[model samples]
Target chain A: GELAVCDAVSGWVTDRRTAVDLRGREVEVLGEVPAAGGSPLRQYFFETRCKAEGGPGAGGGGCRGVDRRHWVSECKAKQSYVRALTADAQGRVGWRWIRIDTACVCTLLSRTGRA
Target chain B: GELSVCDSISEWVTAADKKTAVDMSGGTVTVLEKVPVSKGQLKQYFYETKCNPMGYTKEGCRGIDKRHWNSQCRTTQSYVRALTMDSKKRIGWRFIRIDTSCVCTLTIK
Candidate 1:
């Protein structure tokens, strides 16, 4: 069969981005490690809740805890999220974002040339 | 019997700010970021397709910056073991490692 379409509801439900300012930290280093001081790991999170149940050979089976098997296969995913950050010891650097939505991903695949 | 190991690994990786999910089709999703775990118990996976490079700013089986950096590699065995028990014990788990240039694949039984 062909690839499945995993979408983020509302086309924006799982779309989110934010700049986080994490507290700086200082740690004693053993041996010869970099004397690190600055922002802690900064993370951005996206959340999408959805349910998919129709597909080629998919079923109406219940999803196991944290198991995306049924939802993904059945195209019943409720949410799709993305998390990223600037990791360093001193300060924040330049920033960028990555799209994790499966709808756009599958669309792109369809455009670029199917696998 | 078949079992889903998504939630367990998702929780285990969250400490490292990672995410996990099993596809709606009862298969693992291999995005550039998510770490593919092995079956048996707390291991990597059945395959180890190297993404190449020893840094985070490289493209591989997924998207850009998808491949992780060496500095953030799995140094020690820092995994929280997750287990599930039922009458039919078909579920198993283990932690796998993916260092720069090389990744650990699952050992078939």
Candidate 2:
């Protein structure tokens, strides 16, 4: 068994516009903008994931069930914004706020049925 | 100045089943099961947030606009299962996840 630790991973993501709205909220537009036409704009961000090995008593041990004994956690995506050129509903192109995944944090389940 | 660190804090929370569903999702731990109707409802849970020693920087960590760079704490939500009893005294379990912790990351602004 091994101890589960929370940490972050990094990756590059391309920007895309799906809808145009005030306050820069991410929304689903009927027809999402295509990512094929021109050179894509990309940025780097961090994503959190739990790292551990599986074995007896891996996740603080208390339960009889192997699944129940494992560490429970989740990866949360943190959001931020970047300015990019985008088209409006009227097909007008201009600089707009595009939401981006900026970073991530890992949250461990504090308690469970076993302990 | 000093560097910032993210850590956990403990507090008590009451449980409630806003919309009953299985598999334990803390959709609405809204109902704070009252305490002291006879005694009080209280269960300790951990919360994560920012703490500061403020004004620290790493190599190549420059601000978006200024000469010196800064860092800030970023957080996200998470949930956990807890025991509860409704107003009608229906006892059950509910999800109760909160901002459990945060991480210090670099920022331009």
The top-ranked prediction according to TM-score is: 2
TM-score of chain B of each: 0.16, 0.37
Tell me the TM-score that candidate 2 gets on chain A alone.
0.40
Clashes of each: 33, 9
* Model 2 pairs whose backbones collide: B2-B54, B35-B40, B35-B41, B36-B39, B36-B40, B48-B100, B48-B101, B63-B69, B79-B97
Q: Looking at model 2 chain B, which ten-residue stretch has the lowest summed lDDT?
A: B57-66
lDDT of 1 at B34: 28
Q: CA lDDT, every prediction?
A: 0.24, 0.36
* lDDT for each residue of candidate 1 in A1-115, tens digit (9 for 90 to 100): 1111233232222223332322323221112112125533223222232333357785644322112321232223211122233333454432212223222111111111122
| lDDT (Cα, 0-100) at A96 in candidate 2 | 47
Model 2 CA deviation exceeding 4 Å by range: A1-7, A15-24, A27-72, A108-115, B1-109
